[PDB]
Amino acid sequence: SSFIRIHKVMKVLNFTTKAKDLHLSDVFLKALNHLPLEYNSALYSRIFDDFGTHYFTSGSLGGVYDLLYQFSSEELKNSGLTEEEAKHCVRIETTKVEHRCTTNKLSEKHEGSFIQGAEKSISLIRGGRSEYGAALAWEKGSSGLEEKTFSEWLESVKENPAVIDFELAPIVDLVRNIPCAVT
Amino acid sequence: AASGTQNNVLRGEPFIRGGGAGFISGLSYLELDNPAGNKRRYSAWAESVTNLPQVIKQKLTPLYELVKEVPCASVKKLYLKWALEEYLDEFDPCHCRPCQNGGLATVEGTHCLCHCKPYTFGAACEQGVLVGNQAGGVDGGWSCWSSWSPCVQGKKTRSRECNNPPPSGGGRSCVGETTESTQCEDEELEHLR
Amino acid sequence: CFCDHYAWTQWTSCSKTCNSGTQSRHRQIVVDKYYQENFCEQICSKQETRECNWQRCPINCLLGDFGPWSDCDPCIEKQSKVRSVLRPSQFGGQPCTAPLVAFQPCIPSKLCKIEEADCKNKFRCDSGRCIARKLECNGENDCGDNSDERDCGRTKAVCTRKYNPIPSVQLMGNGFHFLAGEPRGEVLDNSFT
Amino acid sequence: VTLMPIDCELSSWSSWTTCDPCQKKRYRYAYLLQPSQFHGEPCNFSDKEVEDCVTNRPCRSQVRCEGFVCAQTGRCVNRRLLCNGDNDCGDQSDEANCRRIYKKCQHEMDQYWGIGSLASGINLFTNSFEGPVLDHRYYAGGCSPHYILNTRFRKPYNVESYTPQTQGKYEFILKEYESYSDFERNVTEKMASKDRGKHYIRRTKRFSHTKSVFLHARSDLEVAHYKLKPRSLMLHYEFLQRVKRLPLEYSYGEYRDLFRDFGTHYITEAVLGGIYEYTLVMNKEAMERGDYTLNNVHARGILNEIKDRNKRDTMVEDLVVLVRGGASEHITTLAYQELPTADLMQEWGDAVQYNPAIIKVKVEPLYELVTATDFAYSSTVRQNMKQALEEFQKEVSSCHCAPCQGNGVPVLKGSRCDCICPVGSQGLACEVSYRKNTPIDGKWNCWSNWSSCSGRRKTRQRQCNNPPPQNGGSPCSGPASETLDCS
Amino acid sequence: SSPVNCQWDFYAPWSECNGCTKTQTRRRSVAVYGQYGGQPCVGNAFETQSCEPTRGCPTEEGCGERFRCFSGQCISKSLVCNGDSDCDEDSADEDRCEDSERRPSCDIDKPPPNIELTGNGYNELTGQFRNRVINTKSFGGQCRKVFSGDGKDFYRLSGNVLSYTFQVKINNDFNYEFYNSTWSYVKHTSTEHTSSSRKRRSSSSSSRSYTSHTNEIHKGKSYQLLVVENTVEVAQFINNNPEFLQLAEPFWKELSHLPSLYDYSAYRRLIDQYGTHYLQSGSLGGE
Numbered sequence A: 001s002s003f004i005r006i007h008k009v010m011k012v013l014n015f016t017t018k019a020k021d022l023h024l025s026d027v028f029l030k031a032l033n034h035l036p037l038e039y040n041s042a043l044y045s046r047i048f049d050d051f052g053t054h055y056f057t058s059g060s061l062g063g064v065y066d067l068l069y070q071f072s073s074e075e076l077k078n079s080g081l082t083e084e085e086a087k088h089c090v091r092i093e094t095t096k097v098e099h100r101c102t103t104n105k106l107s108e109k110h111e112g113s114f115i116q117g118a119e120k121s122i123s124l125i126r127g128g129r130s131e132y133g134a135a136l137a138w139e140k141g142s143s144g145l146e147e148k149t150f151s152e153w154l155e156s157v158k159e160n161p162a163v164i165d166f167e168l169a170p171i172v173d174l175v176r177n178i179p180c181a182v183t
Numbered sequence B: 001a002a003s004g005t006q007n008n009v010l011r012g013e014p015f016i017r018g019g020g021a022g023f024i025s026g027l028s029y030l031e032l033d034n035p036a037g038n039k040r041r042y043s044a045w046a047e048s049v050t051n052l053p054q055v056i057k058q059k060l061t062p063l064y065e066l067v068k069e070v071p072c073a074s075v076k077k078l079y080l081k082w083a084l085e086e087y088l089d090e091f092d093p094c095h096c097r098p099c100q101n102g103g104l105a106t107v108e109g110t111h112c113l114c115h116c117k118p119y120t121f122g123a124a125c126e127q128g129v130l131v132g133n134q135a136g137g138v139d140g141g142w143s144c145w146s147s148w149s150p151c152v153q154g155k156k157t158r159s160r161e162c163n164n165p166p167p168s169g170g171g172r173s174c175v176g177e178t179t180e181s182t183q184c185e186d187e188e189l190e191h192l193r
Numbered sequence C: 001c002f003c004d005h006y007a008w009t010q011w012t013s014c015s016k017t018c019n020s021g022t023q024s025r026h027r028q029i030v031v032d033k034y035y036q037e038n039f040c041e042q043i044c045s046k047q048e049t050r051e052c053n054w055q056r057c058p059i060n061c062l063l064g065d066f067g068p069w070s071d072c073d074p075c076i077e078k079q080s081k082v083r084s085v086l087r088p089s090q091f092g093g094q095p096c097t098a099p100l101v102a103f104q105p106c107i108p109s110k111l112c113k114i115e116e117a118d119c120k121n122k123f124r125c126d127s128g129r130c131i132a133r134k135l136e137c138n139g140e141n142d143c144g145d146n147s148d149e150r151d152c153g154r155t156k157a158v159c160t161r162k163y164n165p166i167p168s169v170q171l172m173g174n175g176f177h178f179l180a181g182e183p184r185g186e187v188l189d190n191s192f193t
Numbered sequence D: 001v002t003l004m005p006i007d008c009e010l011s012s013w014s015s016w017t018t019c020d021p022c023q024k025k026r027y028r029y030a031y032l033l034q035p036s037q038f039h040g041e042p043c044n045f046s047d048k049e050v051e052d053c054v055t056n057r058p059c060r061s062q063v064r065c066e067g068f069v070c071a072q073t074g075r076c077v078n079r080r081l082l083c084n085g086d087n088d089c090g091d092q093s094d095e096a097n098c099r100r101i102y103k104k105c106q107h108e109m110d111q112y113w114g115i116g117s118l119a120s121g122i123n124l125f126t127n128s129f130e131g132p133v134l135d136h137r138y139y140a141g142g143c144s145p146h147y148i149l150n151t152r153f154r155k156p157y158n159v160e161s162y163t164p165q166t167q168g169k170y171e172f173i174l175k176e177y178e179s180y181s182d183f184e185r186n187v188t189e190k191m192a193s194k195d196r197g198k199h200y201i202r203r204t205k206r207f208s209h210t211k212s213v214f215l216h217a218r219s220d221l222e223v224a225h226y227k228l229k230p231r232s233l234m235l236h237y238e239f240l241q242r243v244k245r246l247p248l249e250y251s252y253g254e255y256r257d258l259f260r261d262f263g264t265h266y267i268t269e270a271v272l273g274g275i276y277e278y279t280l281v282m283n284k285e286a287m288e289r290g291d292y293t294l295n296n297v298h299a300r301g302i303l304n305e306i307k308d309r310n311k312r313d314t315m316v317e318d319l320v321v322l323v324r325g326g327a328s329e330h331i332t333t334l335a336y337q338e339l340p341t342a343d344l345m346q347e348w349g350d351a352v353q354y355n356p357a358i359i360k361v362k363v364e365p366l367y368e369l370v371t372a373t374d375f376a377y378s379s380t381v382r383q384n385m386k387q388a389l390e391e392f393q394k395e396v397s398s399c400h401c402a403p404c405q406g407n408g409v410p411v412l413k414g415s416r417c418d419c420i421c422p423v424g425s426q427g428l429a430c431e432v433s434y435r436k437n438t439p440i441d442g443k444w445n446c447w448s449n450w451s452s453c454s455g456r457r458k459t460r461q462r463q464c465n466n467p468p469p470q471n472g473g474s475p476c477s478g479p480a481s482e483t484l485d486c487s
Numbered sequence E: 001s002s003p004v005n006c007q008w009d010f011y012a013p014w015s016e017c018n019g020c021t022k023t024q025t026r027r028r029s030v031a032v033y034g035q036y037g038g039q040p041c042v043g044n045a046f047e048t049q050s051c052e053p054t055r056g057c058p059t060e061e062g063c064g065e066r067f068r069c070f071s072g073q074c075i076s077k078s079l080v081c082n083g084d085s086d087c088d089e090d091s092a093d094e095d096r097c098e099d100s101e102r103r104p105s106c107d108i109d110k111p112p113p114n115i116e117l118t119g120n121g122y123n124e125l126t127g128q129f130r131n132r133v134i135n136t137k138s139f140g141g142q143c144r145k146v147f148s149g150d151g152k153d154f155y156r157l158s159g160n161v162l163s164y165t166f167q168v169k170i171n172n173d174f175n176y177e178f179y180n181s182t183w184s185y186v187k188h189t190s191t192e193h194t195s196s197s198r199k200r201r202s203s204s205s206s207s208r209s210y211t212s213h214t215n216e217i218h219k220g221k222s223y224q225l226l227v228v229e230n231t232v233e234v235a236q237f238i239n240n241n242p243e244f245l246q247l248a249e250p251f252w253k254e255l256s257h258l259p260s261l262y263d264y265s266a267y268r269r270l271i272d273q274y275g276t277h278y279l280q281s282g283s284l285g286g287e
């Protein structure tokens, strides 16, 4: 049995958002203008279902690779040979004479084999571009990293990252310069 | 006297969604020497899916929530809501006496079809053999909801019997609450009129 | 030993319907000159055992009954009704299925106190966004509406070459939903120059 | 050949209708009592007759047009569609005398690949396409761009969506069986005494070997999904005009000849792509007998010796391949007897995108197009067309054909029936084959007419081809008797 | 199990009378659903007849200060001659405008590669996608560009959509399991005799062989493979809430023609075309 797990986290990019005077998304600014001036729990809750609760003040834009590979193999082997023999002779006389003999014999042979195997792999990729990410995710993983496939995927990640880690401020700090903003 | 036999059965069912039609027909074509599929063809498919994707995971909002900007919109919204509940009650698989061998069922309008799991077949899924990991037994199927109780103390109630089939031979029980209760319809009648 | 000389018995039904049971199968061993001589006692396995029903027991959703209809919003002409999750669903239990918030039309009972932008020296885009006056006739669409460029003379000097934006830059401007652990909607405009 | 060629018989004529208020005509027709088959006479002698009349009744046939009436086609285009730089009348009449042209389409645009095929009606009872019923060359305002890959397309007005849903099943089975048996039984016997003697031998074999292969490969490729608008469809000129020729009074003939030209239903939603199917069946046998003997006797003496040896072998193999959608070289190279290389499969699926077949359909019956915005007396045309559709389904269903031999499928092509043969038989009845038996599938006779009321009954007998003959296959899959309420 | 032939129930009481069509409809439930290959219910789950309505047919309401598109939908007068087809279906907002009054609304005219599939309906019970419910391409007079990077191309988003993103995720799962078994057996048996005698002269002798032998060979092989592989290429589309969504023209037209009373035969024909739900969010990719 053999097992191999790989996890790699790569950070091709790393950004910080301003502290003040940010320019807001059109669809967000529309929903903030639409909200009632008096409190309603349902209508204001719907902002969190649509836009979430916090925004990234800094983070790492990255690619992630995860692989598990797991192999089991079993063999059984059998061989056997056998022989058995018995022989029985007699003479009687008194003119009259008789002489006799008899035999019984056996052999057996056996062979047997049983081979059994299981292989599993599980892999996740985040970030990159689907042709190279496919090429890397498709690796059964029996030897761990194939550095050619991995380095083509990492060159994809530089062109199309995914989020890996982050720092947060609440969405409510952004709601600035709309009508009735403070309210 | 001497005798021998062989049987060999080889099956495979590649299924693909998304990607370009040529890449799909190339990748789904089964190499018996490499039945998982080839690195090159599969990577080409993964390129093409960037340009011909399909929705593969989704979160759902009920269709009545879109009734807007028409005459009678407020009333049409509630009647589409009740028609969804009536459609769900017409097509909910509880109307089907369930299939053997782990098969789900669907309502084909007036009719029940079994979706037999791999290499098991026939109308009840009685024929053939299963493949892969199994828990064994017969898992518990619901019978349909009993008809809704008439707004006693301002709320309806209904009950479901878990007896179609009853969980048997060690199979897992029916999933969901055995009973439900809800507010009445006076809000539609009074407020919208 | 050819341990396959004794049967592929059916696995006995899983001990638990959920939260990691186990199931086992035992060989139909008859001890004989074959079993004795071929080392069967030493190196066969007499019964196999494995995990089954590893999935945690399914937890169904329970919703509360709805609250009162809320104080009606004079600028929206609707009133809102809410209910609370008693326990969320998880581990494959039935989803809450019905809506968790509801709306009804209303005859309001107050005026609207909302105010116009009137935004000093700044430039009011057609969408009402008061962008910086430096961006009027700048030659890039800074209102999103193009309204900063509706009619202009010789526009100010845009950055000379075409340049692409940073890879995935709009992910830096999506909002994140901390309780669900995921991005939800574009909150910052990371196409703005 | 066991055949008798059977001639077509149409009925005696209907009585005439009384003269139509708006067509100024009268009509009579015949029912096909027996289709022509097995090279009987070609028949089709005019199934309908029509005459003129003097008219003593009023007519209101002019459904007005707030639009513009197109000069040649009579179509009512909405007045905003004039001078858009496009042919909305069908025969260009909307773009005459325009002081300027106001193009909406800023760019060049394709029609979606094959979108015009779906504009024609289907004879659902034979799955045959028929004449054009909808105008997918009409766009109204149009000119909102859609992209499949990098190509830009202009959506027809009648089409609600054409979109590249893109899916592929492949299914493979290779089932193989081998079975062999060998038997041998030798004997030897001797005697001598000092005179007399004997010697004798027998030696023998019986043997058999048998093999079977069943192989089946299917690719169901989908490349687009299509749905038609549910309402306000712009109909095709040739259909719009034959519907305006229909009598107000019910003559079956003039409604039947609409269905024989434009089909019975229209495609409201469809799944587009290609089928590749390949299926091989092989059976192989080898058989032997050997028998050898000597007898020798002495006292004067005699000898006899015999040898008998026999070998037999057979193989029988059938292959069927079926391809739908694509381009002619990919079609033929897949049509070829040897399973594809993946390169051809790739090129076939790539070509299926540009010429799809229809995999699955949602129909509506064609009278649902006959809306009062296009036709006067529309409700009486609808009710006639509904009744004709029931009577016609009872004519064009292939249950009328005499039974094929050799498990042939009879198809009623026109007033004439063709037995489409399976692989391994030939001749017009599928009679000419080397085979000792082949499974007959059961064939239904036509379903007997509605009897009485308070719940009517219809009956079927599986008699047209009885299921069991020559080691028969499956008895027919449908309801052997059926019932429906007056009210 | 036996085939079960389908059976209808008795007809239900009628629904209130439809003003616009001057009719009443009544329902008929399936009493026994057909099962195990038994015959389906022939005829219809409904019937409809003429009636004199108390309740009248409702009217449209007008677009007022908004621009009326030919469908009956209303759009803002800022979108007339925007240079985009801002009315769904057949634009009318673009009609007979001057070449100096038309302007480029945006640099580019190309949406993300299957954004139309994100505005489809969904049927929860059949699991199938259903026809167009949301207009996914209402550009709202805005040039909302995204650079992608999974394909190296700019695309234009609708003004409605909350977010659309091209971060990839690829998840692969492989399971392969095989066994091969072989047995071989041989047996041989032999039995023999001889005897000789003399008595006085007279004498006799005899001998024998008997033998039996047997072989068996047996094999079983099994292999199973499962692969489940998923790709996401637009790892999120997040559609807006119903207030800011723009409906598809033929969906809004069918909604307009809903009878304003509980005739389930009308609402079932919407649900059969457009499904039970709409997609609030999801991932585009492949499987």
Ligand SMILES: *[C@@H]1O[C@H](CO)[C@@H](O)[C@H](O)[C@@H]1O
Pocket: D014, D015, D016
């Ligand atoms: C229709 O049919 C009869 C048949 O005798 C004709 O003679 C006559 O013209 C009638 O109108």
Ligand SMILES: *[C@H]1O[C@H](CO)[C@@H](O)[C@H](O)[C@@H]1O
Pocket: B085, B086, B087, B088, B089, B090, B091, B092, B094, B144, B145, C097
């Ligand atoms: C109870 O629940 C569903 C909807 O929640 C119904 O559609 C089903 O038929 C059952 O009665």
Ligand SMILES: *[C@H]1O[C@H](CO)[C@@H](O)[C@H](O)[C@@H]1O
Pocket: D390, D391, D448, D449, D450, D451
């Ligand atoms: C029942 O349907 C109509 C009713 O007259 C006819 O085609 C015929 O009676 C059929 O059996």
Ligand SMILES: *[C@@H]1O[C@@H](C)[C@@H](O)[C@@H](O)[C@@H]1O
Pocket: B172, B173, C016, C017, C018, C057
């Ligand atoms: C199996 O299923 C649940 C629902 C209960 O019946 C327990 O027996 C166990 O978790």
Ligand SMILES: [Ca+2]
Pocket: D081, D082, D083, D084, D085, D086, D087, D088, D089, D094, D095
């Ligand atoms: Ca024109």
